[PDB]
Amino acid sequence: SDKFIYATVKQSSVDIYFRRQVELSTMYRHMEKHNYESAAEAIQAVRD
Amino acid sequence: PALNIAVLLGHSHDVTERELRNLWGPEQATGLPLDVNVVALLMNRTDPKSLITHVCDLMSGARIHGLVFGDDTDQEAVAQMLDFISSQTFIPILGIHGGASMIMADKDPTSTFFQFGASIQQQATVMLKIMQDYDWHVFSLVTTIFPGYRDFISFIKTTVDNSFVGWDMQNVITLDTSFEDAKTQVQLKKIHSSVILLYCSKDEAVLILSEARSLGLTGYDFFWIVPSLVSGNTELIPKEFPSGLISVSYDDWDYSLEARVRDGLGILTTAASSMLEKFSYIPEAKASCYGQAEKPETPLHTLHQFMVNVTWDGKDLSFTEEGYQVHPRLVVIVLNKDREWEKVGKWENQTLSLRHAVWPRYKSFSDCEPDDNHLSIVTLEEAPFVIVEDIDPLTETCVRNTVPCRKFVKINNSTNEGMNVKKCCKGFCIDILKKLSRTVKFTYDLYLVTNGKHGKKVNNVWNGMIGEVVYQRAVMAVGSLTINEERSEVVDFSVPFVETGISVMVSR
Amino acid sequence: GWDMQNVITLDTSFEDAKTQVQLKKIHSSVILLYCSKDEAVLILSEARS
Amino acid sequence: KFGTQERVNNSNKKEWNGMMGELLSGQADMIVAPLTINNERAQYIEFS
Amino acid sequence: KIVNIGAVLSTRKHEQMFREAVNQANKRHGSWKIQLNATSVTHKPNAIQMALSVCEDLISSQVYAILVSHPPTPNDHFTPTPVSYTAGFYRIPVLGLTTRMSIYSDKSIHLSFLRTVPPYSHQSSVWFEMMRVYNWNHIILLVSDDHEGRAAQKRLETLLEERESKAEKVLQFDPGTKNVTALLMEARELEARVIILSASEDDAATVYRAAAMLNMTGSGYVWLVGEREISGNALRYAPDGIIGLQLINGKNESAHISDAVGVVAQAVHELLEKENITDPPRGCVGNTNIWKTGPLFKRVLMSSKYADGVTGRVEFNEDGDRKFANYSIMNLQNRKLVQVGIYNGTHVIPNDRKIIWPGGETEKPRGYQMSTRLKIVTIHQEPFVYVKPTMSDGTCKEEFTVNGDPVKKV
Ligand SMILES: *[C@@H]1O[C@H](CO)[C@@H](O[C@@H]2O[C@H](CO)[C@@H](O)[C@H](O)[C@H]2NC(C)=O)[C@H](O)[C@H]1NC(C)=O
Ligand SMILES: *[C@@H]1O[C@H](CO)[C@@H](O[C@@H]2O[C@H](CO)[C@@H](O)[C@H](O)[C@H]2NC(C)=O)[C@H](O)[C@H]1NC(C)=O
Ligand SMILES: *[C@@H]1O[C@H](CO)[C@@H](O[C@@H]2O[C@H](CO)[C@@H](O)[C@H](O)[C@H]2NC(C)=O)[C@H](O)[C@H]1NC(C)=O
Ligand SMILES: *[C@@H]1O[C@H](CO)[C@@H](O)[C@H](O)[C@H]1NC(C)=O
Ligand SMILES: *[C@@H]1O[C@H](CO)[C@@H](O)[C@H](O)[C@H]1NC(C)=O
Ligand SMILES: *[C@@H]1O[C@H](CO)[C@@H](O)[C@H](O)[C@H]1NC(C)=O
Ligand SMILES: *[C@@H]1O[C@H](CO)[C@@H](O)[C@H](O)[C@H]1NC(C)=O
Ligand SMILES: *[C@@H]1O[C@H](CO)[C@@H](O)[C@H](O)[C@H]1NC(C)=O
Ligand SMILES: *[C@@H]1O[C@H](CO)[C@@H](O)[C@H](O)[C@H]1NC(C)=O
Ligand SMILES: *[C@@H]1O[C@H](CO)[C@@H](O)[C@H](O)[C@H]1NC(C)=O
Ligand SMILES: *[C@@H]1O[C@H](CO)[C@@H](O)[C@H](O)[C@H]1NC(C)=O
Ligand SMILES: *[C@@H]1O[C@H](CO)[C@@H](O)[C@H](O)[C@H]1NC(C)=O
Ligand SMILES: *[C@@H]1O[C@H](CO)[C@@H](O)[C@H](O)[C@H]1NC(C)=O
């Protein structure tokens, strides 16, 4: 949905894994707009 | 300053010298700092001695700073000769039509000779674009020892290796010689149902296609895509060419000769204007071809670096370093059931626009087996069963677990017609259809219904998927179609693969 | 649990357009052939090719 | 970036970014980092 | 009955010996059925003048083939380009005697052009054999950016693809670059010590001079080059121990004239035994149609194997170039080229001479030198790779774990 926002590190192994998967494609399109530049920034964003 | 541009043409065309001069009379400040004195000339025939004498007389008398050459015959040698002449006179020459328009591979570095044509690389790019647009990812590659085949194969391999599309290039076949004798049947017999990119000459493509028909390689499911090399002269068509032979070529239908000459003059004038803005003045032409002048002869300023950045009235006619047009006017033509080359698609500003969104099946020959394993299937979008989405932005093709489906979307409500946009359909019913295709061994052309909605009898006329099926516009209706008494009376239903009654949903 | 993929009958000649699209349909590793010796020679030569 | 095959905007060429591109371009001889082993990366470089 | 054969030759005496060779071939084959006329034209300084002269003199004489060679002047900037174009209009076969440029191997440009000398790109084949003989798997190419360098690179990579191996780096420099130290510096940091050069004499001299200052010509390095890079100015600055090639009769006008005349006479005799043969066009002006049997004549010529040639067994491959030529491998020992082996049609065979590799050592240098200074790349991941700013003295403060052991930092 638009309330629960989730993402991961841009251009990383998990991004490739979600791109390759056939079932999860929809939620991949949810993460491509919120992917973070680094893991530390994503962790900080989760923290606050 | 005055810029003298010479236009050499042939008697085959009906254009006259007065018309060529009048072509440069638009009078809207075509050249801001300079005017162009077009001098026209018609030559009976093109051959080394007379061609050289004509060009040298033009350079000596008219003192031309450029040239626009349009040849009538199909002599591929002429282009080479023109290049040579340019390297000996530094006259910027433009190949417009005929032999001068056939792209030569490696021009002399010191020669300013540009051609109105598409190289084999651009033709291969257009062919791969056709294949990607029609989802013909699996393909073969049959070439011969014809010159330039190595570059064609190398470019195809490079484009396949550097693309996100599947591009399952099954094999590469190089028929050295003795197509019917031996050592070629063995290679040609391992090609299965796929797209066969063929690179050879016309007189040799005839033999290759005859052998392929003898080997049963020209069915409904075999698509032979070829460059302009084998299509050649559209007027003459061999009986060995199968119908549906897809080819790409420089368009001689819409791009008229007058438009070609106007574009060439515009290119030369814009390059001269850019040189005037950047450099000091127009360099005077060389004194003469003959005499063996003792000088390096290299001009201080030339038009070579100014033809790469050219923008005429509306079109971008820029050239590359090798002398190819950056935006060639390429057209994709097929050999229809009437045995005439019918234009299908076009290649404009790096986009391939195709008339047929879905590829029409072409009967290759009169004795070809009838098409029975190919079916037209209707489908309607339902949220859990048939999900319709757009094409993948990354790979520009339908994603995994999803199948192409053409939706007839109108331009707007103002018009009473539309275009078929190829979207990607998935879901429960689409998975069922894929399994059915795998098991029953049939191919399908999925397409969304635009007449009605799930089927209904209005004025004794069925709309929707039921209407499409009953009126023989489709073979089956895969979707969220409920078995009914009247529908079963009208059409024949399969076994119900999911139980769907009528039920009432309320807010808790 | 036999898996009998297809039945192929070579009614036409063994070199024309037919019996090439038919013979290409064989994807199994076992082929039960039935013909005369003279026809077997031609069919096996075509299969080897 | 850890590394992911992306299309460069010109000529539509596949290219590796991050550590993958650094190693494949010769700028680095080894990647001692949390580099996940997957099929996409293993086709071009080889993991221990 | 009389059959004309044209020859654009460097000097008058070359034309005389061409006529003598034509007479000898006519005597050998027999002039009772067909007599081989021989017309000759000296080269002209202006390319346009030469393209007019071939029309006025050779084409107007209704010739069947044209034998073109380089002029006596040392300049060789694609001299047979006029002829190969003009006689290429009518698909009249053209025999190149001593033109070793790689552009003429492109049959899409020079439609009807054969030659009895392999182009400068086929030298790469020899290099490959050396790699098979001395077991060199890591190499560096220094091809130029023109058509010749690209052709040599393409041929070498095509050969290497059969070995499922690739050159470490293919460095390309524009022709006539004064400063090339950047590419050489880039090459030095690599591992491969087999440096292969494909460049003109001036560019080869520039590369040699720029590599001398970088001490890249010392012990452990091995240089493989062609014929242009050990001839002329490039030989003046050539590093010692360089290994180059030399075609046995590449600069011999008379032998090539004789064998080309012999093979063209045999091809003419074989062709005139076929049906519906068409006479060649007479005069360029007023005749705009190609020779009908021109392609057939060229196909006959490419499929003809001269038995006893002065330069050896004359054989043309699919590209129309000479096949199975003899390359005399030369090594620069004490500022003097000595033949340390010869590459025959397929294999390299050495001789009693000892190869002195660069640096003066006699033992065969290894292909490369493994680097023990790995360039490591890391990414900032908190549990695995902490990264912290350094203090002002260039290091960062030493810490200790809970056990008191110091943390190892780089
Ligand atoms: C080949 O035959 C032609 C005649 O068909 C000869 O061409 C002329 O020969 C004379 C004397 O050698 C020259 O002065 C003329 O200039 C030639 N005509 C032309 C084209 O101008 C030719 O000599 C014969 N070849 C030989 C040397 O025997
Ligand atoms: C040739 O080019 C190289 C690379 O540019 C020069 O090497 C260095 O170039 C930088 C500028 O990019 C200078 O600041 C350095 O002083 C150069 N170091 C040296 C001396 O190698 C090189 O100097 C150039 N050589 C010539 C004579 O043009
Ligand atoms: C010269 O070229 C030939 C091929 O034309 C090379 O092949 C050798 O040919 C000889 C002919 O008697 C054979 O006996 C050898 O067995 C062939 N080579 C090998 C080692 O298999 C030959 O190597 C070249 N050089 C020589 C030694 O003549
Ligand atoms: C073209 O043909 C005409 C008629 O034969 C002739 O008069 C004219 O000289 C020819 N063109 C030129 C200039 O050679
Ligand atoms: C040259 O190319 C540039 C690319 O941005 C373009 O903006 C400019 O208009 C071109 N030169 C002309 C036509 O003045
Ligand atoms: C061609 O298409 C590209 C991509 O949409 C666009 O950027 C370009 O402006 C187009 N050129 C024209 C003028 O059609
Ligand atoms: C415009 O839309 C209306 C429905 O609002 C439709 O009835 C009408 O046919 C449309 N116009 C056309 C397609 O002529
Ligand atoms: C045409 O398209 C526009 C797009 O904004 C839409 O608003 C309008 O309703 C459509 N109908 C007409 C006027 O054709
Ligand atoms: C295109 O690619 C180049 C090279 O990676 C990059 O520098 C540039 O920013 C890109 N442009 C865009 C916005 O796509
Ligand atoms: C060899 O040349 C290099 C070039 O940088 C230089 O640094 C080095 O000191 C030289 N070694 C000798 C032999 O003096
Ligand atoms: C050229 O070859 C011939 C025949 O082999 C020979 O007699 C002549 O001396 C050679 N000339 C040179 C300079 O190589
Ligand atoms: C040679 O040409 C004749 C026509 O003059 C033709 O009948 C014959 O078949 C040709 N020979 C070949 C190519 O078999
Ligand atoms: C090459 O060298 C051998 C050495 O015996 C010589 O006899 C022969 O004529 C040459 N053959 C070729 C391939 O030119």
UniProtKB/Swiss-Prot annotation, chain C:
Tissue-wise expression: Detected in brain cortex, olfactory bulb, hippocampus including the dentate gyrus, striatum, thalamus, superior colliculus, inferior colliculus, midbrain and cerebellum (at protein level). Detected in brain cortex, hypothalamus and cerebellum.
Intracellular or extracellular location(s): Cell projection, Dendritic spine; Cell membrane; Synapse; Postsynaptic cell membrane
Effect of residue 37 to A/R: Nearly abolishes inhibition by Zn(2+)
Assigned protein family: Belongs to the glutamate-gated ion channel (TC 1.A.10.1) family. NR2A/GRIN2A subfamily.
The record's note on its domains: Contains an N-terminal domain, a ligand-binding domain and a transmembrane domain. Agonist binding to the extracellular ligand-binding domains triggers channel gating. A hydrophobic region that gives rise to the prediction of a transmembrane span does not cross the membrane, but is part of a discontinuously helical region that dips into the membrane and is probably part of the pore and of the selectivity filter.
Complex formation: Heterotetramer. Forms heterotetrameric channels composed of two GluN1/zeta subunits (GRIN1), and two identical GluN2/epsilon subunits (GRIN2A, GRIN2B, GRIN2C or GRIN2D) or GluN3 subunits (GRIN3A or GRIN3B) (in vitro). Can also form heterotetrameric channels that contain at least two GluN1 subunits and at least two different GluN2 subunits (or a combination of one GluN2 and one GluN3 subunits) (in vitro). In vivo, the subunit composition may depend on the expression levels of the different subunits. Found in a complex with GRIN1, GRIN3A and PPP2CB. Found in a complex with GRIN1 and GRIN3B.
Function in brief: Component of N-methyl-D-aspartate (NMDA) receptors (NMDARs) that function as heterotetrameric, ligand-gated cation channels with high calcium permeability and voltage-dependent block by Mg(2+). NMDARs participate in synaptic plasticity for learning and memory formation by contributing to the slow phase of excitatory postsynaptic current, long-term synaptic potentiation, and learning.
Official protein name in the record: Glutamate receptor ionotropic, NMDA 2A
Species in which this protein is naturally found: Rattus norvegicus (Rat)
Range of the intact protein held here: 197 to 245 of 1464
Swiss-Prot record, chain D:
Positions bearing carbohydrate: 9
Posttranslational mods: NMDA is probably regulated by C-terminal phosphorylation of an isoform of NR1 by PKC. Its phosphorylated state is influenced by the formation of the NMDAR-PPP2CB complex and the NMDAR channel activity.
Compartments in which it is found: Cell membrane; Postsynaptic cell membrane; Synaptic cell membrane; Postsynaptic density membrane
Expression tissues: Detected throughout the brain, in brain cortex, cerebellum, thalamus and olfactory bulb.
Binding site for glycine: 34, 36, 41
Domain notes: A hydrophobic region that gives rise to the prediction of a transmembrane span does not cross the membrane, but is part of a discontinuously helical region that dips into the membrane and is probably part of the pore and of the selectivity filter.
Subunit field text: Heterotetramer; the NMDAR subunits are modular and harbor tiered domains that function in concert to regulate opening and closing of the cation-selective ion channel pore. Forms heterotetrameric channels composed of two GluN1/zeta subunits (GRIN1), and two identical GluN2/epsilon subunits (GRIN2A, GRIN2B, GRIN2C or GRIN2D) or GluN3 subunits (GRIN3A or GRIN3B) (in vitro). Can also form heterotetrameric channels that contain at least two GluN1 subunits and at least two different GluN2 subunits (or a combination of one GluN2 and one GluN3 subunits) (in vitro).
Family membership: Belongs to the glutamate-gated ion channel (TC 1.A.10.1) family. NR1/GRIN1 subfamily.
Summary of the function given for this chain in its UniProt record: Component of N-methyl-D-aspartate (NMDA) receptors (NMDARs) that function as heterotetrameric, ligand-gated cation channels with high calcium permeability and voltage-dependent block by Mg(2+). NMDARs participate in synaptic plasticity for learning and memory formation by contributing to the long-term potentiation (LTP). Channel activation requires binding of the neurotransmitter L-glutamate to the GluN2 subunit, glycine or D-serine binding to the GluN1 subunit, plus membrane depolarization to eliminate channel inhibition by Mg(2+).
Name the record gives this protein: Glutamate receptor ionotropic, NMDA 1
Source organism (scientific name): Rattus norvegicus (Rat)
Gene name as annotated: Grin1
Residues of the full protein shown: 483 to 530 of 938
